[PDB]
Amino acid sequence: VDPRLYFENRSKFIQDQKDKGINPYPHKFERTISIPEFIEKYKDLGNGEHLEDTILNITGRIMRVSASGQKLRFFDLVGDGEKIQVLANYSFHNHEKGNFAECYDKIRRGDIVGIVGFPGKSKKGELSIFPKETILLSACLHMLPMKYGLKDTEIRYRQRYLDLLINESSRHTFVTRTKIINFLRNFLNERGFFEVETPMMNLIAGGANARPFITHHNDLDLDLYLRIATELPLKMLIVGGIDKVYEIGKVFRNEGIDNTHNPEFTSCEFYWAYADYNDLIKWSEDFFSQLVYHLFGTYKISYNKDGPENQPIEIDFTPPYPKVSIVEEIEKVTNTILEQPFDSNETIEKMINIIKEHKIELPNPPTAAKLLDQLASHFIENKYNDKPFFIVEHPQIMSPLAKYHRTKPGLTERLEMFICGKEVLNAYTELNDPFKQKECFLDSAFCTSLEYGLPPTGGLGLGIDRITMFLTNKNSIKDVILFPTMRPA
Amino acid sequence: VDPRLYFENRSKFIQDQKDKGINPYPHKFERTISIPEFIEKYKDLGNGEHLEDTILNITGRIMRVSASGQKLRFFDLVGDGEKIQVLANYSFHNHEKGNFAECYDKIRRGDIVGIVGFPGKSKKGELSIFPKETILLSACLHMLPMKYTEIRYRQRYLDLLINESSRHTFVTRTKIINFLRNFLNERGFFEVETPMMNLIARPFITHHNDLDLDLYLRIATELPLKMLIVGGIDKVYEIGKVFRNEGIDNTHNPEFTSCEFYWAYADYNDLIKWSEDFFSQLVYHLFGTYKISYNKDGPENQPIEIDFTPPYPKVSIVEEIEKVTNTILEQPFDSNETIEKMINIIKEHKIELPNPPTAAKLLDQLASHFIENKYNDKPFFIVEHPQIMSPLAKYHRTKPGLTERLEMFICGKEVLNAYTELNDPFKQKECFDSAFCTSLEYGLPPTGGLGLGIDRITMFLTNKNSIKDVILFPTMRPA
Ligand SMILES: COC(=O)c1ccc(OC)c(Nc2ncnc(Nc3ccccc3S(=O)(=O)C(C)C)n2)c1
Ligand SMILES: COC(=O)c1ccc(OC)c(Nc2ncnc(Nc3ccccc3S(=O)(=O)C(C)C)n2)c1
Ligand SMILES: N[C@@H](CCCC[NH3+])C(=O)O
Ligand SMILES: N[C@@H](CCCC[NH3+])C(=O)O
């Protein structure tokens, strides 16, 4: 019952073994079949059918120990997410290698073993390996949580291996996460896009609005910023003639941690020459509907927005998705005209007064771009929760790198897609006129590259961790990152 | 002639066009076919053959400007690394949309243009696009050079536009990583992401504000991946950036791309076989052969042939030093006698003494000058390094003081490092990271782990002598 006592006893057991000549951590084991291959090959045997002439070397982790007398031992063996039974019968044991009871009394839950034996099914129909010999390969010195015991704690996020061993759902979640990225990489590659890597470290951190991380470069004797986005170097590659380009990799933002914000997270940003806003809308609807159907065989999924203790909701990913113009909707909802320029003193005061009258938290500093973001969050960002939708046509002052709207003054051809009130996608027609970049006349290198001619371009960015959360029914981003950022305890 | 005046003149042209009601940066051109698709579908056209009844919308970048008389204007149009010619002929100019000379007088080398026209070949046989209308999509305000050395690194877009061997170099790099991803995926490996920032060579140090604690950029992915082996991901790998805050040279960058995999129940021969399978097939997948040419000493000097036909030689580091230097290195290798011996061979050859003169560094120095260039004929492995050079590698089964470590070399440059894991916690001297020793106590199976230097591999497979030439935006000293 005392985990400390269990550990010291197991430590003494390990030393007891090796001063008896037996190496409890042997060098190699010539495994011949894996547990998933074993299940695939022998799922068809009848109950009680033994294949005694087929000798297999199989490895796994013991997860359950029981017996029926000293001459019959039963175990669960797991590997690669799959499970078989171990049925050790005294009469099938290779007695030359050692005493049968001595061999199997040592096995504890969590032990990694290598088994030489034959496949079969028991009379109870459970597929089993029937050992002639089992060898300890790596002992589990600790009492593994007793199943359904890691259910909720910080041990899952720190000792993630325990989480993957005990909780069957977690492995499926991270398998789904890799299937998302594989689908996204295949989706883009099928359409001619070219994957690249751009520096994790730059003298500026552009391409988004976020506080960066600062680190020191010893060789260059210079302070660099961890990238907050891949946007600027990617658009420079468009200038270089890589007309379809993208990058899936980590970005860093040094701000508040919560259930949808992790200091480092995975983004996909692609840039698509000679495409525009309308292509990006079509791309987003094509990708999400195809991705959801790929994983589920349907466009409708369940998501526990208000936790697992409340009824879920249905998110329907059947395209098209609704589009809402941010300034128009805010003006309609608040019955107030936001007069241009949006960053005028009057309009800033008018936006604050709306925020004051509705008791919406005033952002710091109350800049026009942030005030508009707060009004959008409070008034439109939770309009649709049964389906995803786009907030579109953001003002130029919120979109410094987006092309000016081709018919609506003061706006851009920008789109953000939201699922259950969370942004997962940001895209727009790319501003390619160097003289219209207010920051030009901010990277000197990027602004200069614009002067060599950036073709009309559409670009898009994705939040992969947030996408994985909805597609795996998780309310916290820590549950889709293998080792989330954590305080030291 | 003066670049500053050219940029000033071109900038004024953009403003002059705006005042005239023309937008020099239009929002959307509905392209109908790409340049490579265009070359594919009309390469077999007859000379002088037109197809007037097929109108096509095409985009590209003007890379050359010329004119025959004044009613025929000749251009080079490049896109996706491929080129056609623009045949602007006054007869096929749609005058309803603008003056012929007015349109084509403005076009400068580097302009991104959109073209409405038909496909055909000229009399001389050069496949051409014949515009009815040509629209400026995005203008090149500077003069594009023709030849240009450090502009390549600071303005990679110019390199990608001008050199046409830079584009091949970085297409090869992506193909290398794609092959590696698919190679591991077909073998049942599972790709994951582990943190770049931890509480852990010299590190890069950053600070999170709200948490108010320092974080360190990972130097490798070894530790979290091995923890995932404990967690039951028996075949796991990650491809991504790692950071070592040291000096820059042709084969070391502080930020570089690594692949690490860990493979439960793999033994030493499994790791050797994986390496020989991967490198031989990757080379063959790229070139249709196992033998490549590589300029070891730059393009000025002679090139050598590297044969990637498996199997590769295996060399034991200690026994090979002993044979080449004609001494014996008695164990423990960190005894005052053997260290002083190794110091004395270093002095006798006037090789640089590593600071500090620790046993592992001296052994690395001896390997570098006596072993690591044993073969430039082919890749080869330096194997079975002492335990004191590899604190995480399992002990050798039969040879005292050694491990089952393997290190693969191309032209004296390390590109691969692997070994079987020391999974017994009571033999791990670090135990007696606390997060790692704890994970060992829950049971790490016998496992093989391998790491790959993607940048160095791409260098050799694109005939490059500097890591700067395979990184799109190498980190440069600013002004
Ligand atoms: C300041 O601004 C930030 O963004 C920010 C700040 C701090 C953070 O941690 C501490 C994160 N960390 C994160 N963690 C997972 N996801 C995302 N995404 C995301 C977040 C906000 C808006 C839009 C998006 S998004 O996914 O549409 C975009 C990537 C296309 N951010 C983001
Ligand atoms: C052990 O290294 C280091 O302490 C180190 C120190 C400084 C560096 O920059 C400043 C790098 N940066 C780098 N840049 C490109 N390539 C590589 N490779 C590489 C380098 C040395 C040994 C082995 C390899 S390797 O290709 O076998 C791969 C398995 C790591 N390292 C590595
Ligand atoms: N860089 C943007 C995504 C791409 C926007 C289109 N250029 C972001 O971080 O939100
Ligand atoms: N992390 C090692 C490669 C894998 C080591 C084997 N477990 C390196 O950077 O050289």
XYZ file of C-alpha atoms in Angstrom, chain B residues 109-328:
220
model
C 12.684 43.038 -66.193
C 11.138 41.483 -63.088
C 7.525 42.603 -63.516
C 4.893 40.045 -62.578
C 2.382 40.179 -65.431
C -0.900 38.566 -66.372
C -1.508 37.643 -69.999
C -4.640 36.856 -72.013
C -3.731 35.135 -75.260
C -3.357 31.944 -77.271
C -0.648 29.259 -77.414
C 1.653 28.660 -80.336
C 5.185 28.282 -81.627
C 7.132 30.885 -83.573
C 8.791 30.268 -86.935
C 12.119 29.624 -85.191
C 10.323 27.058 -83.017
C 10.459 28.674 -79.565
C 7.225 27.882 -77.720
C 5.458 31.151 -77.002
C 2.406 32.786 -75.481
C 0.807 35.365 -77.796
C -1.045 37.988 -75.731
C -4.084 39.910 -76.843
C -3.795 41.877 -73.581
C -0.977 42.120 -71.029
C -1.693 43.412 -67.519
C 0.818 44.440 -64.869
C 0.118 42.423 -61.710
C 3.106 43.435 -59.557
C 6.127 45.473 -60.623
C 9.780 44.955 -59.707
C 10.888 48.356 -58.430
C 14.602 47.474 -58.299
C 16.929 46.253 -61.026
C 17.282 42.477 -60.951
C 20.988 41.540 -61.194
C 22.331 38.801 -63.477
C 25.157 37.036 -61.599
C 25.691 38.142 -57.955
C 27.786 36.315 -52.919
C 26.249 37.224 -49.557
C 23.209 38.699 -51.301
C 22.175 35.048 -51.707
C 21.917 34.564 -47.942
C 20.354 37.946 -47.099
C 17.994 38.054 -50.122
C 17.166 34.417 -50.875
C 14.325 35.414 -53.216
C 16.840 36.895 -55.664
C 18.830 33.656 -55.487
C 15.662 31.644 -56.133
C 14.776 33.875 -59.101
C 18.230 34.125 -60.693
C 20.343 31.034 -60.071
C 18.027 28.076 -60.915
C 20.431 25.802 -59.048
C 19.301 27.292 -55.743
C 15.757 26.177 -56.585
C 16.960 22.630 -57.285
C 18.925 22.627 -54.018
C 15.869 23.413 -51.890
C 13.550 21.159 -53.890
C 16.005 18.351 -53.119
C 15.922 19.249 -49.414
C 12.134 18.912 -49.213
C 12.314 15.639 -51.145
C 14.875 14.382 -48.615
C 12.588 15.166 -45.673
C 9.536 13.766 -47.487
C 11.405 10.525 -48.164
C 12.524 10.328 -44.528
C 8.984 10.918 -43.249
C 7.535 8.262 -45.555
C 10.453 5.882 -44.928
C 9.823 5.879 -41.172
C 6.032 5.924 -41.597
C 6.050 2.784 -43.752
C 8.082 1.077 -41.002
C 5.380 1.768 -38.408
C 6.983 4.827 -36.817
C 4.734 7.446 -35.215
C 5.500 11.151 -35.615
C 5.103 13.386 -32.555
C 6.002 16.866 -31.344
C 7.862 17.483 -28.080
C 8.527 20.879 -26.461
C 11.115 23.248 -27.851
C 11.154 25.096 -24.501
C 12.051 23.234 -21.307
C 13.055 23.970 -17.727
C 16.343 22.126 -18.420
C 26.646 22.421 -25.502
C 25.450 25.840 -24.312
C 21.713 26.651 -24.285
C 19.552 29.397 -25.671
C 17.782 31.042 -22.723
C 14.389 32.763 -22.814
C 11.876 33.919 -20.214
C 8.109 33.546 -19.901
C 6.598 36.645 -18.323
C 3.391 35.489 -16.621
C 5.025 32.323 -15.281
C 8.149 34.358 -14.389
C 10.689 31.606 -14.950
C 13.447 30.992 -17.473
C 13.069 28.411 -20.236
C 15.752 26.707 -22.322
C 15.547 25.714 -25.970
C 16.039 21.997 -26.525
C 19.440 20.805 -27.696
C 17.906 17.468 -28.773
C 14.664 15.503 -28.650
C 16.249 12.434 -27.016
C 14.694 12.646 -23.556
C 10.955 13.219 -24.278
C 10.983 10.636 -27.086
C 12.461 7.954 -24.819
C 9.750 8.809 -22.291
C 7.220 8.103 -25.052
C 8.812 4.671 -25.509
C 8.085 4.038 -21.824
C 4.530 5.213 -22.522
C 4.092 2.514 -25.163
C 4.824 4.358 -28.406
C 7.326 1.667 -29.368
C 8.265 3.413 -32.650
C 8.387 7.196 -32.294
C 10.174 10.013 -34.103
C 10.262 13.784 -34.480
C 11.576 16.056 -37.236
C 12.231 19.613 -36.139
C 14.653 22.265 -34.996
C 17.168 21.910 -32.165
C 19.356 24.640 -30.724
C 22.998 24.674 -29.607
C 24.307 28.151 -28.755
C 27.830 27.775 -30.127
C 29.960 29.133 -32.963
C 29.056 29.030 -36.644
C 31.029 27.211 -39.323
C 30.343 25.411 -42.603
C 28.860 22.345 -40.866
C 27.535 23.798 -37.582
C 24.588 26.152 -37.255
C 23.161 27.115 -33.841
C 19.692 26.280 -35.194
C 19.568 23.097 -37.261
C 17.096 20.446 -38.386
C 17.318 17.068 -36.656
C 15.472 13.785 -36.944
C 15.501 11.447 -33.956
C 13.737 8.100 -33.781
C 13.488 5.554 -30.990
C 12.691 1.939 -31.752
C 11.712 -0.475 -28.989
C 13.431 -3.896 -29.063
C 15.824 -2.770 -31.806
C 19.386 -4.005 -31.353
C 22.730 -2.835 -32.742
C 22.347 -4.667 -36.059
C 18.842 -3.226 -36.469
C 20.267 0.294 -36.230
C 23.090 -0.472 -38.675
C 20.639 -2.049 -41.126
C 18.226 0.891 -40.889
C 21.055 3.320 -41.663
C 22.256 1.354 -44.691
C 18.698 0.871 -45.959
C 17.772 4.539 -45.528
C 20.866 6.169 -47.030
C 21.131 3.777 -49.984
C 17.430 4.081 -50.838
C 17.342 7.853 -50.292
C 20.279 8.291 -52.672
C 18.692 5.944 -55.208
C 15.296 7.632 -54.823
C 16.998 10.929 -55.736
C 19.373 9.978 -58.561
C 18.508 6.550 -59.972
C 21.861 5.206 -58.764
C 23.871 4.628 -55.598
C 26.948 6.630 -56.667
C 26.992 10.430 -56.472
C 29.514 13.123 -57.338
C 30.506 15.602 -54.637
C 33.053 18.442 -54.667
C 34.796 17.759 -51.363
C 37.204 20.697 -51.764
C 34.937 23.165 -53.546
C 34.115 23.519 -57.241
C 37.644 24.713 -58.068
C 39.251 21.411 -57.044
C 38.508 17.903 -58.311
C 35.313 16.039 -57.357
C 35.176 12.601 -55.777
C 32.651 9.778 -56.140
C 30.733 8.618 -53.063
C 29.295 5.106 -53.382
C 26.167 4.537 -51.282
C 25.874 0.846 -52.172
C 25.419 -1.116 -48.916
C 26.902 -2.512 -46.735
C 29.270 0.125 -45.314
C 32.513 -0.481 -43.396
C 32.502 -0.597 -39.600
C 35.472 0.767 -37.648
C 36.019 0.462 -33.888
C 37.270 3.818 -32.635
C 39.622 2.659 -29.871
C 41.135 -0.266 -31.771
C 41.522 1.846 -34.920
C 43.253 4.674 -33.052
C 45.524 2.039 -31.508
C 46.432 0.563 -34.904
C 46.953 3.871 -36.722
C 48.890 5.540 -33.890
C 50.753 2.346 -32.854
C 49.971 2.643 -29.143
C 47.652 0.908 -26.681
